[model samples]
Every structure is written in structure tokens, then in C-alpha cells.
Target: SEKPQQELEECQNVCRMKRWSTEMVHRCEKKCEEKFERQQR
Candidate 1:
């Protein structure tokens, strides 16, 4: 069974905050893109 969707929403919120910083945002965007790409494979 699937876990709670709230946990994923919470993580997205945290990622949004981390993306507020220029350097962190750049790094996070790169990492997250890679992560999504990997998941797609």
C-alpha cells in the first residue's frame, strides 16, 4: 500500500525553501533533475 501523500508534500515544501538560495537552488535543481531522470530509467 502507498504511504501518506503528506510526506511527499512536506518534502516538496522543504525543497522549495532550499531552492530560495541561489547556490543551493542551482545545486538542488541539478540534483533533483538527475534524480527524476534516474527514476524515469
Candidate 2:
């Protein structure tokens, strides 16, 4: 039906955006933490 096709189109982009949003935060957190650790070392 039309709904399944709509869902398919929206699902991938929405999932990628949300996944990227979460990853960017966690990735930045780890990167920033490493930077501080290096500074003290």
C-alpha cells in the first residue's frame, strides 16, 4: 500500500539522522575526554 512505501522512504533517513545525532554526541565525548587525558600526561 501507499503507507508501506512512505514508511520505507522515511525510515532510512530518519534512522540515519537519529543514529548520527547520538553518535556525534558520544564520539565528541570520547574525543574530548582523550584530549584532556593527553594534556595531563
Candidate 3:
């Protein structure tokens, strides 16, 4: 929530630009979350 806010937003931007399928965009953001937010394990 705190440390990765910028990184999350950056990933959000990248995710936005990619125009990928819903699942793929989610996949990219999920990777970011795992790296920066450590949300899942």
C-alpha cells in the first residue's frame, strides 16, 4: 500500500498502455503486486 504506491501506479500505467486482454492485464498487474505489494504470498 505504501512502499509500492508509485510502482503500482507505474504498473497501472503500463497495464493501461498495453491494451491487453483482461486476463493478461490482470496478470501483469498481479506480477507487480507480488513484487511490490507482496499481496499474494
Q: TM-score for each prediction?
A: 0.41, 0.41, 0.61
Best by TM-score: 3
| Top candidate, metric lDDT | 3
lDDT of 1: 0.57
Q: How many residue pairs clash in each candidate?
A: 0, 0, 0
lDDT of 1 by residue, 1-41 (tens): 26455554555556768737777766765555455443456
What's the distance in Å from true for residue 39, model 2? 5.8
lDDT of 3 by residue, 1-41 (tens): 34638767898779867867988888887787777744456
**Candidate 2 residue-wise lDDT, 1-41, digit = tens:** 43235444454445455546777755655554454343456
Give all candidates' CA lDDT scores.
0.57, 0.50, 0.75
Worst 10 residues of 3 by lDDT: 32-41
Which 10-residue window in model 2 sums to the lowest lDDT? 2-11
Ranking by lDDT: 3, 1, 2
